Design an enzyme around this catalytic site. Structure first.
Site, PDB file in Angstrom:
ATOM      1  N   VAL D  58       0.809  -1.227   0.000  1.00 55.44           N
ATOM      2  CA  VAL D  58       0.000   0.000   0.000  1.00 55.44           C
ATOM      3  C   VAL D  58       0.846   1.284   0.000  1.00 55.44           C
ATOM      4  O   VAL D  58       0.680   2.133  -0.882  1.00 55.44           O
ATOM      5  CB  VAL D  58      -0.962  -0.023   1.205  1.00 55.44           C
ATOM      6  CG1 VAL D  58      -1.698   1.284   1.348  1.00 55.44           C
ATOM      7  CG2 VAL D  58      -1.970  -1.140   1.074  1.00 55.44           C
ATOM      8  N   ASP D  59       1.759   1.457   0.954  1.00 48.59           N
ATOM      9  CA  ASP D  59       2.535   2.704   1.070  1.00 48.59           C
ATOM     10  C   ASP D  59       3.810   2.824   0.226  1.00 48.59           C
ATOM     11  O   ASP D  59       4.507   3.840   0.339  1.00 48.59           O
ATOM     12  CB  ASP D  59       2.892   2.953   2.523  1.00 48.59           C
ATOM     13  CG  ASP D  59       4.036   2.079   3.012  1.00 48.59           C
ATOM     14  OD1 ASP D  59       4.558   1.249   2.232  1.00 48.59           O
ATOM     15  OD2 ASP D  59       4.443   2.240   4.177  1.00 48.59           O
ATOM     16  N   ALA D  60       4.131   1.834  -0.606  1.00 49.61           N
ATOM     17  CA  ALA D  60       5.398   1.791  -1.344  1.00 49.61           C
ATOM     18  C   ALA D  60       5.626   3.018  -2.228  1.00 49.61           C
ATOM     19  O   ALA D  60       6.652   3.704  -2.115  1.00 49.61           O
ATOM     20  CB  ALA D  60       5.441   0.515  -2.189  1.00 49.61           C
TER      21      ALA D  60
END
Lengths: 266, 52, 67, 77, 52, 77, 77, 77, 77, 77, 77, 77, 77, 77
Positions: D58-60
């Protein structure tokens, strides 16, 4: 003290750097310009933590009983089992190398993040006032340098396992055909799978960098901007919260490293 | 902040600690734990044979 | 009003024309007025409330069931 | 003049949108985790394992955008 | 502008943080380590009784 | 001169938008995955593979906005 | 001067929005694909076939907006 | 000069977006937590414990953006 | 003169918003289509017929905006 | 003069976004609280307790953002 | 002259939001329509009827906007 | 005079975004209140009391932003 | 003079936002209407009556803003 | 002067944001009203009574923003 707070915040960020040409301990008033200026603080604190980890675990690995373990041994075997379980459930190939790599990442990154918790001025105070040294910042993980060095190491390993276990024909077929698998769209797949491949290490490195750098910057700001009495009430929450950050960012790095290699070999 | 030689310095230190841990720590500890697990579980073998 | 039957595997417990019921359905208490859309639920043990037509209330105790 | 402040505004865009994307995406995923956990408590260690597994994706890219926003604020400006 | 007084503020926050960790964070860890020693001890004792 | 800098204000838009698109796009997708995993907890390793298949299509156009954003910042300037 | 720069900012806005549109559209479609598949694994190949079919439509209008971003930077410049 | 107020407007944008992201992400997570708490009241201490773990993730990026805003407002201007 | 580059920015935003609107609208429609197909797969040809019928009604305003955006970019600019 | 004027615009964006974030986050959480309370009336005071606990986490960052909005509009004004 | 730029910009943003509104407004309605058809396959012609009844209301303000957008772009400019 | 007109725009943002925040936050909450009433017509008063309690929290920051919007628009002008 | 430019722009924003608001608000209400209909067609004309009763309120502020938007664009010119 | 069209843009802002806020808030609440009606199609008058009770609240802040938009639109602007 003659320090303006506006620049006290800046001097913190400036590294201690060794010029491969001059071998000289630079200071924050003027930064020289070359690539070859190792950040002295990061290398020394990084190897100090990584060798302390290796020695403590090696000493138990040397003694280790199959009887009732000592309490210290019990904590070490606890985390050995914690990592072994995570590997076994996530990875279903053979390779011996996955588990120790994951253990080194988890404990070493945890220790590097833990390095931030100790009060921001205390070691810089010791260095400047007593030991007369020109600069200090103590946390390795706050740097891009360490986080990209690690993430590029994992990227190499992805290339190694993917060519080992299925080789150039499978690897290129995946990159060329997948996602669509339609021979009419191979150039699109080539872009999408290349940038998907390169996204994984860059995201790995930048997540850890950004979290630990901003955590340090908060501690710097709290120490710099506020009156010291007021600083305790705001500083205690961030330190508590940071405990959770340091732990999860280590855990997540280990977990994703395993997942990416399991996905690469299978 | 900016890029630096330190990235190579850390990459050398990392691969050395990777091989040192891999050979020296990991099989010795896992072997110690599994040798305990074996001797505990073979104690059940004592009951299986005795009962039969 | 609507026709309500309360029936057990052994016997019939109630029948009649009813104005409303209040019922402790499994995922939280429920109420049935006339024309209520088709519904199916399990229920918990406890007193169901019946309001018979011309407003005459009576209670029944159910040990469970399906409404 | 025009060197400094536009880089500060670009960084403020990058880091603000990266916080929006990360915090909503993580909130949705964690909500579905808590719904499953409340249904299946025995699964909670299994489900939280799968949660972290999915969450890492998700946060990559938001972390790409935050890392570059830090580079533009500190490294260039 | 006291680096010391700001170091005093740091020392207050850091001792508060340690006292919290020692009351609230370390005992949960030690309780799990002691539960691990307990599970190992009971496993070995029951294995010996099956050998008997 | 602003000819070196408004590129970076543009790049903050390019990838900052794509970050909320990808992060919420993955965050929703992972959300539906976790519910099925609580309904079909034996089936999860199948589900996770199918998740990776469809997740692999989420990347592409956010990834272009990232790659052209970086390319604008460092290749174009 | 900045005449040429605003064309890069127009490309950035166009590609950033197209990335949101595609990433959320595939995020929701793929979520409902996963829940359908979790309920009916025999259907997984049929569901995946219809998923790829609908995803072609989802992608086509983002694809043209990205191709116009590429034409603005490369072809019109 | 007029550089100060642009730095303030950048920090204002960045904090506003970070408060939107934090408030919505935690709001969603807390809503699904309260559904779980209504179903499983004896579980609520356990679910409350697991809820804080993911709430820390959700807040991690917002705290970055708050810190960088405070740096620009207090320290640079 | 300034004139042409604002027209490029106008076409850029017009088609960027068309791409968001159409991609998310078709994502939502496709998601409910796929859940329906998983529920009653012997109805997939009828659901295809209806999905395409509704897809024709969704895309009309996006394709109008695409038409104007492409005219302004190629013909006017 | 404009140095004074744009600081009201900055306060306006800070406070507007903090109001949106807070009101949305609390509205979602409150909706799930009312749904639980309607289902489980005896639980109402216990759920009320948990609702206040999680509401206190939701409001932290909006209150930081309005605290800065008030610092900007009254202090730098 | 400078009148052309902002006329074309107004008509672009006006019709972009019209595409956003109408494509989502019908996407949602079409989704709940297709759920209904896949739950209830006979009613489809009656569902299609009442769907067309409400579809005509969703388009009302978007069609005004698109009509006024063509007026600005071709009747005024 | 150059000063006051821009302040109408700053009021216009504060009061507009506070309108969005309160309108949607209370719209969602009241929707879940209506669900609760439709399941339990017999409990409609008790739930209305709980609705008014949580509704008093939801609008607190919108009430701040409008109160200061009025201060800026009428009184500081 | 310049005044035409901003008056056309203000009409384009005011009607574009009213168009989004009405389109999504009716699309949501219609989605619940069509679900309630598909569950039980015998009700459809009663639900249709109450739907139009509600739909009259959703359109209030949108059509007011359209009335002002047409007045500005044509009459204030 | 620049004042007049700037103040008409400020009104157009308040009218756009109030139209969005009201139309979404009432569409969400009315959707829950229609599902509640479809559940108990004989209790429609009671649910409609409570619907108007909460509608007056969700309208209250939007009707402030429209009244002020009106105030500036016909007074100072």
């Amino acid at each position: 003290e003659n320090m303006t707070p506006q620049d006290y915040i800046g001097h913190h960020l400036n590294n201690l750097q060794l010029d491969l040409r001059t071998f000289s301990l630079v200071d924050p008033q003027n930064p020289p310009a070359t690539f070859w200026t190792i950040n002295i603080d990061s290398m020394f604190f990084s190897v100090v933590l990584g060798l302390l980890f290796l020695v403590l675990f090696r000493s138990v690995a040397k003694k280790a009983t199959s009887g009732v373990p000592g309490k210290f041994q019990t904590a070490i075997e606890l985390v050995i089992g914690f990592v072994n379980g995570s590997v076994k459930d996530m990875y279903h190939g053979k390779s011996k190398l996955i588990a120790p790599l994951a253990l080194t990442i988890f404990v070493w990154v945890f220790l590097m993040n833990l390095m931030d918790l100790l009060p921001i001025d205390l070691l810089p105070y010791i260095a400047e006032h007593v030991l007369g040294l020109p600069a200090l910042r103590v946390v390795p993980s706050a740097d891009v340098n360490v986080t990209l060095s690690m993430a590029l190491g994992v990227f190499i390993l992805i290339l190694f396992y993917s060519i080992k276990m299925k080789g150039i024909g499978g690897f290129t077929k995946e990159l060329t055909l997948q996602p669509f698998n339609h021979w009419a769209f191979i150039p699109v797949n080539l872009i999408l799978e290349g940038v998907s491949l390169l996204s994984k290490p860059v995201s790995l490195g930048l997540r850890l960098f950004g979290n630990m750098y901003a955590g340090e910057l908060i501690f710097i700001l709290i120490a710099g901007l506020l009156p010291w009495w007021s600083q305790w009430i705001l500083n205690v929450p961030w330190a508590i919260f940071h405990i959770l950050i340091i732990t999860l960012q280590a855990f997540i790095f280990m977990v994703l490293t395993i997942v990416y290699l399991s996905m690469a070999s299978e | 902040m900016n890029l630096n030689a330190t990235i190579l310095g850390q990459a050398i230190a990392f691969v050395l600690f990777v091989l040192f841990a891999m050979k020296y720590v990991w099989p010795p500890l896992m072997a110690a734990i599994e040798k305990r697990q074996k001797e505990i579980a073979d104690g059940l073998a004592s009951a299986e044979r005795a009962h039969k | 009003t609507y026709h309500l039957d309360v029936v057990s595997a052994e016997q019939q417990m109630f029948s009649g024309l009813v104005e409303k019921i209040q019922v402790t359905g499994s995922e939280g208490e429920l109420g049935i007025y006339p024309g209520h859309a088709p519904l199916l639920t399990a229920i918990k043990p406890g007193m169901i409330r019946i309001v018979k037509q011309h407003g005459h209330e009576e209670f029944i105790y159910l040990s469970g069931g399906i409404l | 003049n025009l060197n400094m402040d536009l880089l500060y505004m670009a960084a403020a865009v990058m880091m603000g949108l990266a916080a929006i994307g990360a915090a909503i995406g993580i909130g949705i995923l964690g909500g579905k985790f808590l719904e499953g956990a409340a249904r299946q408590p025995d699964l909670i260690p299994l489900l939280r394992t799968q949660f972290f597994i999915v969450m890492g994706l998700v946060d990559a890219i938001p972390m790409i955008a935050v890392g570059l926003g830090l580079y533009v604020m500190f490294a260039v400006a």
